[PDB]
Amino acid sequence: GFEYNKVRPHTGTPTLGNKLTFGIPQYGDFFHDMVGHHILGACHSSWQDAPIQGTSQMGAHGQLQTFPRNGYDWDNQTPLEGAVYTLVDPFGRPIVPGTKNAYRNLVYYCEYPGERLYENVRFDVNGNSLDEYSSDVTTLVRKFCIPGDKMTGYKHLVGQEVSVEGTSGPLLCNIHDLYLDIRRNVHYSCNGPQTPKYYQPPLALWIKLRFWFNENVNLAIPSVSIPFGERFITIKLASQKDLVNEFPGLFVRQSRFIAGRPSRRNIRFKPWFIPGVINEISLTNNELYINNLFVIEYMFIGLKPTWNISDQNPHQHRDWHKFGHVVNAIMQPTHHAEISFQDRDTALPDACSSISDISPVTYPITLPIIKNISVTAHGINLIDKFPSKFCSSYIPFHYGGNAIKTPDDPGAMMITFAFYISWDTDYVGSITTADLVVSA
Amino acid sequence: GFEYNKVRPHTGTPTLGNKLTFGIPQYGDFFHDMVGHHILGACHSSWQDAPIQGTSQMGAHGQLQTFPRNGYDWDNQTPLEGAVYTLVDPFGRPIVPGTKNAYRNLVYYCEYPGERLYENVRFDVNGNSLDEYSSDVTTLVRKFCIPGDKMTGYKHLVGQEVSVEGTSGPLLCNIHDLYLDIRRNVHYSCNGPQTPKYYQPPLALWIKLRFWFNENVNLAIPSVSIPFGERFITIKLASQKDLVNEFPGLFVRQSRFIAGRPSRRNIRFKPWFIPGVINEISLTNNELYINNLFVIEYMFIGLKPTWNISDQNPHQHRDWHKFGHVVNAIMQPTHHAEISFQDRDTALPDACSSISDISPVTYPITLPIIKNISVTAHGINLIDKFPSKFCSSYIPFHYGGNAIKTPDDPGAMMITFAFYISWDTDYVGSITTADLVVSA
Amino acid sequence: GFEYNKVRPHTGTPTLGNKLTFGIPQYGDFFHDMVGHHILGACHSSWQDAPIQGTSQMGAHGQLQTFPRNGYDWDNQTPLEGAVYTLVDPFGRPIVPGTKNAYRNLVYYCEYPGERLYENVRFDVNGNSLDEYSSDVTTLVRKFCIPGDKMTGYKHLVGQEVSVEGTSGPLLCNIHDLYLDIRRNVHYSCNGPQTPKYYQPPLALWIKLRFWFNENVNLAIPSVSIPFGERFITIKLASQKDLVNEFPGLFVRQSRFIAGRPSRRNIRFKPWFIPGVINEISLTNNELYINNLFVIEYMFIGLKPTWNISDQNPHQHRDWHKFGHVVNAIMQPTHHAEISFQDRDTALPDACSSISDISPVTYPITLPIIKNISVTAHGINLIDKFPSKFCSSYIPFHYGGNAIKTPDDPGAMMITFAFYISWDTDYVGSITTADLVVSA
Amino acid sequence: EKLVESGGGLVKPGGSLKLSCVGSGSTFSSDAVSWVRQAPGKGLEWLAGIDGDGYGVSTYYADSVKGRFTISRDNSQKTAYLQMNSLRTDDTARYYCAECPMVLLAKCSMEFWGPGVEVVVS
Amino acid sequence: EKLVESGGGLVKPGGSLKLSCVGSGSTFSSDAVSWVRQAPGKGLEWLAGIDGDGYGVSTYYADSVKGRFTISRDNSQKTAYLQMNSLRTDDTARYYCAECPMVLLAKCSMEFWGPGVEVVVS
Amino acid sequence: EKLVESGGGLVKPGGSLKLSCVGSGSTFSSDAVSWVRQAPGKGLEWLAGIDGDGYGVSTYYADSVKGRFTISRDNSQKTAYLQMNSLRTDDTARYYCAECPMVLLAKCSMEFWGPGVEVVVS
Amino acid sequence: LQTVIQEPAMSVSLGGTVTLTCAFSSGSVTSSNYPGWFQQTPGQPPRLLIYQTNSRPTGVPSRFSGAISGNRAALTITGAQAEDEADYFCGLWKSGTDLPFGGGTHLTVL
Amino acid sequence: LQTVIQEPAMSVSLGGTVTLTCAFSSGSVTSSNYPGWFQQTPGQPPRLLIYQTNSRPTGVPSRFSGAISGNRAALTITGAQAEDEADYFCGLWKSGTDLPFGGGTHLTVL
Amino acid sequence: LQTVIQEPAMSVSLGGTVTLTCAFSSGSVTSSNYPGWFQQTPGQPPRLLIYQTNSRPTGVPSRFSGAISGNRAALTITGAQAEDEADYFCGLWKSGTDLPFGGGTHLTVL
């Protein structure tokens, strides 16, 4: 027999960025798994004023946002022949300059916000912390030991959006062989917490606590082995600025007419990003579900640049978990058209047009930061100068069985034994290290 | 040793919507699994006449189809400035109004047509039905107990289409870091039975019969346990109108010219859907591959709105299996262009154009209908007012092992024990319930 | 204890298309798994000349490439009204006719180049080959006995590209129920070795050797059971012409003006593909990693047309591994626009435009080549006249457990027993057969 | 959407005449034009008609006037012309235009009408 | 971007006048035009101005001239017009244009100026 | 695709002349024009030529006439002009156009020809 | 020949209900002939009341109705008024290129 | 009323530093008024030196600076030259529809 | 200098095969010179027969052929007729900016 009881926070009304404590009661003869349930409240941003043409202002991350005058480039100093600048919404809806309380920034969350919330978990027995981990071993656990069939449930628990598939109408095709056919196109879309929205609804998060006895039903420690009043759980919740971020709510639209033959019209866009204030997020229904039952050979290593988690990173919310050097590739699709007004001379079009989109398409590309890794021992040299892809890909592929999944990031490495990690690196900068020694 | 021999229908020449019977003979000392093989015939629709401008007719599902006059809105009553209406195919090929036998509707199938076919399966031994299930337990077993590694074969057996991948030519990109590159785009398409086609080729269906002894090779019942002449299998095949459906074969094209500066041209489309007659589908090669070998702790609950399966639902063929409240999100991509005819005043374009597509892109979004679920017993409360996502997501994720897959729908719930399902609901309407008690 | 030792090639400086030999030494009491590591060098093509208008030249596979004159069709003989032909790059950058050393072709690799490299592997003990397999058994192994969770690592080892996901900005949607929302679009892209590039960087390949004792850690043969100097591994590397291929670096742009009302402008493209010379690829860091540990019931059959691997096949690099008849479906997306210059008569647009892309979208569609298959026995008929999909789909789906994955190709069949393969086809041509008898 | 007729007057027998119809609508180029006549003391009689842009433009005629009358269109100036040859003494009537809100003329509507011009043959 | 003024001359009291301003820039149709006058021996005084294309075009006036002056724009010919009614003896001054490098006139810069024309009332 | 030539006649020595060539093809603006002459009793001699739209337009000349002749194009009116300065007594010949079915003049074919005009210097 | 016939004249009391009929000489009128009804106040161009046997253009009162009764085309005026004193025409679309009108029926509102 | 107040005239030594001031009659000048500064050599149209209190249009030397000091707008010329002898005007954007200028200050370089 | 050399005159019997040759003064003719062959019936503009040494424009019979033999350009007429009696010109594209023609060979069909 088993039922899930409730445990209330001992501290009282927790906040984002402060210690939180649960007290473990002895209700059943064994306790097996623990789940933390939290409900983050609604979010939005403050109203802002529209700029005046010619204004330059210091934005986020030391970036200067400008609203250039007519006939000047994006720096408001270099002349341009026919540029005209207006203001628009992220969806193309116009805005009049100078209007008070004219626009709001959009708000979105981090990726896997249910994993960044618990920045530190400790299980204390009158002090003497039996176990303690951070929000780094959780990333290794999800990248290695989660089967993959159960990714939908896990991404639902930690509040990560899942793409939804849609279809189009029938279309004609011409087959070749060495004929016509009807086919459909398949598209994907997202609507979760990570999509920038004007108003983010309350978010419910379930977070499973992972101690050495929680792995198996037969290994759960008793609730009587230790005196009743000494058991405590301490959690250091992450700050609000590490969970929510803002997306620009105002764009500058540039229209340029180039004279000649063909005469051309070009339309481009540039964000106007000035940070605002997000209201305080409050945690409600903070509960701990404890299940009451009634009567070395592996190591995962992560090499993460410090640039990933630094506050000066404009993309830290996306890249806070990736193990590698992340660059960005930008597609900018464009609608092109050519028109001829007469039939006397038609070698070249009389007019052209190229319409751009308000926001581009961004692809994150992760690259390795390690060429050779060696984990020496005081007795023998042990692993020596093995290539990165040997430890990253081949070892998980061969060893492990169905339990260990082959990771995706190039920086997540795995080595088998049956403690001085040095590496060769062409990347200049600080590098963080995470470890997880497990036996299977 | 195992040999797959065939069994013929006892009734003789089955039809779509009537009882079907197989008689099991004693050929081997044991029988392990049952597979039914059917071949549904070809399908098409009947020819129809093109309408006359100004006509309104009574369409399907109580919807009024109309072909408005020039200068009026879609309701043929509200004036509009410059609307002009013509007729087209789904592929843009024109049609002249009034022509006799001018077009045909397109036909497609349901999703997973091999699961709706067996609406009811009974195993009888001179009466006294040992087992009996419907076309709802099968949906639960495919959403829970199918590994997902073996989903391509299952989707091939029941006649469900799979998407095919394709690529484009090389394209240029500008990388950023805090450079140029060549990349390819990846697209997907579908060509299966569910794509609307003028003529649907014959469809072969293999359907596996799931009785308690068919789960494992060691649990199969013998063929000598019960007297020879009493074994029978009874199946109630689904009707024809619950398997195939029609898609419009005629569209009304509206072109509107808006005067001023910029002068604008808009092109939009609207279906003209009048139901036709689909020929009778005949089952052939109806066989049963009986295999002759030669010598509680789980509950899955699905709560389905009655709107999903009602004949008045315009999307019942898509949503007949989903456990949740289904809404639709429609995206309509558009080609936009602006042209200027001179260089005197170029602040605003001289002309604009917006071209739509004949059919939009539709995303089905499933939402939960349950906030709290309790399965009480005469002894104690057991599960009491637990949230929806705890039963939907966390329970499959933790318990089960590799056998149980985490479902995708918000209405499929799992509860563990080692019988009065009440729920709290913000949705007004009837709710169907499906249960499946299994032990593992 | 286990560490990976390195073994150097015995022959000395391997080349692409010649025999290669390793000599196994006795270092540990057992050897478990063997991995070959190679590093293929950089690739590129030679500079070529631009053509002169009116030229026709014989290209690859006996195809005639032409650069038509003004006012003629693609065959340079049939008159056309207003065709004008110029030269461009794959990215639209113009090229002047007659220029010396004006363009280069692009180079790409085969699909799964790490599997085509080892065209024949032999294990010799003073002759007397204990085992021998080709590059066809490996394809069956990957299509059947690889779990699927571990496919990212495998595709990284053999140099097969993996798609990367990106997102766009927020977009507005209108919901319907029987309301507005913000959603995102999800796209995919590729950048691996199989994407045509001007310069292909060096490619590192790890290839696992599969002998009967390598399957399990407990079944690895000892290094002492056989005399020390008799063990040898022989590998016949594939030729350079079977690993890399070229993509056109020059395109012909046709622009046509059609007079009347509406006046129309059409732009289309056609490749100018003349083969060049690719430099010799050199293998470096050729190593063998030997693990030094310190102290019938299944058949997979693949039916492959000889057209798949024939040198005259323009798509042999894509289709060298597919078990079926492969056709191609081509989509050609187009940008369309309509413009009206006045407001007197506006029934029909005054001008139109349709712009095509330089390269189309190609989907490979695989179709079965077998209708009935029978593997008879000298005693009884055994499997007789079973349909193709019974052996391709149902048998893997039911039998096998989690080990056997359900394949994706219609030509890969599996049959269970506890040797004369005949088949019935509607396909005329040569057919190749591959077999792999395994017990589990 | 209104119409104005012009070009009607006394015609000597055996002559030829041309009647013009000017429209001032927003969809005149996508509307089917027709010509109707009414002898004094009799009922309406349909004479000829033309289609509108959007499909193949074509001209339809009655049986009593085919070969003698010709209907033509001019969308640039928003005008419809009727040319009548070999007028007989039994053609003294009143001629109206009729523009439907439709493209094709087969089974039309004939909503809008013009004031008409009184043509006399004597 | 330069400007040329014309239409200024001696005007009898109680009359009306029109002044024209011709621009030869590449963005004249997207620029805010304004009129500024300067009496002899005094400081500049702003009179009226109009917006540019891109939003709703509107005309703003001062308090001492509202109801008597009217500013108009003509982008086709690249011209701005000022119409002055009921000129008094205290209007003898010099009038300049000021083409803003901006779409809206509110809180502008007025970088470009023209030579001006000497309007006299006597 | 035919050509019509004009502007040829008797010219006093030391004068200047202009020859015009008018095309009536559907791709005249994308075709390379050239001018050829033939003295009586001799063979053809190539003089000058111009490119077609699609790339950079340029003019090429021979060695015996560079600096004295000038070839120009006018696509709007479908015309090509040749201006000849300082004509000598050894230029009495017949002048033809040659419209290439090609964009660039380099290594053309010169399929189409005109009837020619008789230019005399005396 | 296919000619259109109707009653030469009809009468009605003010505020009453009166039905006019229209027919072919030999054939049978169905919904595929698309009958239309026209009114002509003397000295004025004809005005369209009923098109396609049921629909009314904007600006026509709801007291006018049209239908097909047996093999006849019927127009019903309910609640007659003084202004209704005029002539009524029925136009039938036989084939696809012929529109023979009717003789014209004068309606007398006493 | 809201009127602009300046000094009547000022003086400076060649190569010196001189600051002109501009103020409201009753209110307080802030950065939301967007003050601008104009120069008018005799016989020539006014020329713009400072807009938005710190920005300089192209073609103006770097010795001209502007700022807001306390509740006044200040223009500073450092390193005066002979040509600088002219009149200076202050333009204040009060509200969104009125631009009252200043009296105009004559600068004398001794 | 680079000048074109042709035979002054040739002869052929009716229905025979005759080959005309065209050469450089010092260099060697290859396929990169793109020789062209022209025919000029007296009183008429020249007409193009062979371009790029192998291709025929539409409207020219198949009895005309062109090739490069050794280091000369050869035009072969097989099955001569009466109309073929005219002058033949060879034009060679040396460099990319000069097209020197030939002296012209008169062909006589006896």
Author numbering:
A (entry chain A), B (entry chain B), C (entry chain C): 71 to 248, 303 to 419, 463 to 585, 606 to 627
D (entry chain D), E (entry chain F), F (entry chain E): 2 to 123
G (entry chain G), H (entry chain H), I (entry chain I): 1 to 110
What do the paper's sentences say?
The outer icosahedral capsid is built from 8280 major capsid proteins (p72) and 60 penton proteins (H240R), organized into 12 pentasymmetrons and 20 trisymmetrons. Three copies of p72 and five H240R molecules constitute a pseudo-hexameric capsomer and a pentameric capsomer, respectively. p72 is one of the major protective antigens since monoclonal antibodies were shown to neutralize virulent ASFV isolates. All four classes of antibodies recognize conformational epitopes that comprise 2–3 copies of p72 monomers, locating on these exposed regions (ERs).
To define the epitopes of antibodies and expound the characteristics and the neutralization mechanism of the antibodies via structural analysis, we determined cryo-EM reconstructions of five antibodies (B1, F11, C9, H3, G6) in complex with p72 at resolutions of 2.75 Å, 2.98 Å, 3.48 Å, 3.24 Å and 4.36 Å, respectively. Except for G6, all other antibodies have three copies of Fabs bound to one p72 capsomer, where three B1 and F11 bind on the triangular exterior of the p72 capsomer, constructing three vertexes of the “triangle”; three copies of C9 and H3 associate with the triangular interior surrounding the three-fold axis, occupying three sides of the “triangle”. By analyzing the antigen–antibody interactions, the epitopes for antibodies from classes I and II, represented by B1 and F11, are largely overlapped, containing 11–13 residues, primarily located on the ER1 (residues 122–124, 127, 139–142, 157, 166–167) and its adjacent ER4 (residues 511–513) from another p72 monomer. Compared to C9, B1 and F11 exhibit a ~10° clockwise rotation, whilst G6 shows a ~30° counterclockwise rotation upon binding to p72 capsomer. F11 and F5 displayed a 400-fold difference in binding activity, presumably owning to key residue substitutions in their paratopes (Y51 in F11; G51 in F5). Comparative analysis of sequences and structures between class II antibodies revealed decreased interactions in F5 due to the paratope alteration (Y51G) when compared to F11, the latter forming additional hydrogen bonds between Y51 in LCDR2 and R139 in p72, which structurally explains the reduced binding affinity for F5. We found numerous clashes between antibodies (B1, F11, C9 and H3) on adjacent p72s in trisymmetron and zipper, and also a few clashes in pentasymmetron and zipper. These four antibodies have potentials to cause the dissociation of the capsid as a result of the mechanical forces generated by steric clashes.
